[PDB]
């Protein structure tokens, strides 16, 4: 599924990402935009054999188990397939554990490169929430 910008903002607010561990809602909408372009089925195979899954491109090396990645650690204790659903529940749950690490949202390369330091609030502006 490909979310509309406002559609995802509302969903993420419902999934408790409005001010989760010091990160305003705009951060998550922006991250999703540049990580997957709001596409829940997005996947990207990496050189280390790992794959990034879902709307928030969660990596199979540290966060989810897709059973095909070398030194997998499965920190989110969840199968990567669960992150490829039109239902963002699992992606949000795992993303919350990821951001609870000291590295914060810096785990998301696209967020770091295109959102951090910008007016992220703009991403939820003009939306019925």
């Amino acid at each position: 599924k490909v979310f509309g910008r406002c559609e995802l903002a509302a969903a993420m607010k419902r999934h408790g990402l409005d001010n989760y561990r010091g990160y305003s809602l705009g951060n998550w909408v922006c991250a999703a935009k540049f990580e997957s372009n709001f596409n829940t089925q997005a996947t990207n195979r990496n050189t280390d054999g790992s794959t990034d899954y879902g709307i928030l491109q969660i990596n199979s090396r540290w966060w989810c188990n897709d059973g095909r990645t070398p030194g997998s650690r499965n920190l989110c204790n969840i199968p990567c397939s669960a992150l490829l659903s039109s239902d963002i529940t699992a992606s949000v749950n795992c993303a919350k554990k990821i951001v609870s690490d000291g590295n914060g949202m810096n785990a998301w390369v696209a967020w770091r490169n295109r959102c951090k330091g910008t007016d992220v609030q703009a991403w939820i502006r003009g939306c019925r929430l």
Partner: antibody, heavy 113, light 107 residues
């Protein structure tokens, strides 16, 4: 599957450092976030803190920086050190993973002269 | 810190009857509210995560609802094994905090 178990002294003196160990069996400590929680005599629970995958720690400000949570991969154990304890630190201590799916059995530590 | 207030402090019920336990937060925490059960001489057991998400291995009679500042844990048809303490905990902001707990006893 995963198993957690606390170990350490059950009686300590005021002003000393209370140290507990949580032994993890079933998987590597490098594969989860680990925490410490304690229950005071009044049935009051306090989340003490946790150490995540990057080694970063989060400590409850209530502990006024007397706490340290460390890990030992080789022994597949993590620890809790609480400095300058007082009778206010008497409680039942538990270790559990961040998700809250796995908990230790809990261990009572009494601080007394 | 975020303060969680649970009510009632104690609740007596006859097995077979249903009950609802309240937990309200001092500020909005979205859906980041979890429920734990704890019996004497035992470690807490996670019953519901993120306000209403079910947990594998937990009896289906337990359900959670709410968002923002008001949350409830419901038990459809209480069983004797359900008597004990119930605590809510928020993970929206550090430090994580627990409500004062609600004791469920047989009437």
């Amino acid at each position: 599957d995963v198993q957690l178990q606390e170990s350490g002294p059950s009686l300590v003196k005021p002003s000393q450092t209370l140290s507990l160990t949580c032994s993890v069996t079933g998987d590597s400590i490098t594969s989860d976030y680990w925490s410490w929680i304690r229950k005071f005599p009044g049935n009051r629970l306090e989340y003490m803190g946790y150490v995540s995958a990057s080694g970063s720690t989060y400590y409850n400000p209530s502990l006024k920086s007397r706490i340290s949570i460390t890990r030992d991969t080789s022994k597949n154990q993590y620890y809790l050190d609480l400095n300058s304890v007082t009778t206010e630190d008497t409680a039942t201590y538990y270790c559990a993973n961040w998700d809250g799916d796995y908990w230790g059995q809990g261990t009572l530590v009494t601080v007394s002269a | 810190d975020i303060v969680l207030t649970q009510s009632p402090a104690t609740l007596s019920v006859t097995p077979g009857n249903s009950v609802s336990l309240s937990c309200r937060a001092s500020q909005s925490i979205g859906n980041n509210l979890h429920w734990y059960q704890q019996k004497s001489h035992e470690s807490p057991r996670l019953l519901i995560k993120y306000a209403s998400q079910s947990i594998s291995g937990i009896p289906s009679r337990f359900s959670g609802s709410g968002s923002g500042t008001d949350f409830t844990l419901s038990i459809n048809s209480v069983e004797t094994e359900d008597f004990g303490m119930y605590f809510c905990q928020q993970s929206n902001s550090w430090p994580y905090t627990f409500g004062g707990g609600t004791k469920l006893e047989i009437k």
